[PDB]
Amino acid sequence: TPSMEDYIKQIYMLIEEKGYARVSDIAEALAVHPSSVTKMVQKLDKDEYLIGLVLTSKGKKIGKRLVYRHELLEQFLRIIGVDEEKIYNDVEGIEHHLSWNSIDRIGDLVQYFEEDDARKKDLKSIQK
Amino acid sequence: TPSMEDYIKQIYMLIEEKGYARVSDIAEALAVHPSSVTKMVQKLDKDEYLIGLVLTSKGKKIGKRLVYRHELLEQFLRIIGVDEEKIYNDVEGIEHHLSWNSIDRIGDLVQYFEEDDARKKDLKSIQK
Ligand SMILES: [Mn+2]
Ligand SMILES: [Mn+2]
Numbered sequence A, B: 001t002p003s004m005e006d007y008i009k010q011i012y013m014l015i016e017e018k019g020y021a022r023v024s025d026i027a028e029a030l031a032v033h034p035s036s037v038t039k040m041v042q043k044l045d046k047d048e049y050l051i052g053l054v055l056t057s058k059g060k061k062i063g064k065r066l067v068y069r070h071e072l073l074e075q076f077l078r079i080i081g082v083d084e085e086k087i088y089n090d091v092e093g094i095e096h097h098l099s100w101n102s103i104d105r106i107g108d109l110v111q112y113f114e115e116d117d118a119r120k121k122d123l124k125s126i127q128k
Helices: A002-018 A023-030 A034-046 A057-079 A084-097 A100-114 A117-127 B002-018 B023-030 B034-046 B057-079 B084-097 B100-114 B117-127
Strands: none
Touching: A002 A023, A002 A034, A002 A057, A002 A084, A023 A034, A057 A084, A057 A100, A084 B084, A084 B100, A100 A117, A100 B084, A100 B117, A117 B100, B002 B023, B002 B034, B002 B057, B002 B084, B023 B034, B057 B084, B057 B100, B100 B117
């Protein structure tokens, strides 16, 4: 689910940032009460994404994938000229509704612009 | 809301297709129970999107924009080479989570590829 992915992402990011994931930090990162974190952490444990709390290899794999996908979509929206202020909220929504196929094709397109700057200028010219 | 956008879009599409929007057709289009439809219909009436379901001018403007947005994003995923079978499901989800700014820039991106087929060919080459 979207929520589960939001949690796994924030947990992975805290562990990379701090070395551990506190319930209070997850709650602060997701703007939720810790009782919701506690209840969700018990599901993630049940579904073997985690064992403070430690991500299993399964949990680590998904976390890293979600971070990559967020970063990819940010650079996609940035490349096509979306106002920087708007990018995060858009990515945070759309990330959960894109198939791997779309993600990978968005990947190729990001690569398409990056390998020749003229392409970027031509895209900019249309926006005029 | 996302749900409200789904309903307004489907109502607009039925009126364009058939000339009218019956609650039973709405229910089938969204695969929901009629009571869910009637609840949203009253909400849309209260919010002056509609009044024998008839869109007010406010309702038509939004309906037309939502149909446009859907088509645009289908075209976007299609151009970048997403498997046709996967496109509709992805668009159905992301359409609610993109700012107008993102939609406009995606519009520019679609225009970018549509105006020179060589650009499409160059993108497909990268995909190899
Ligand atoms: Mn998110
Ligand atoms: Mn939808």
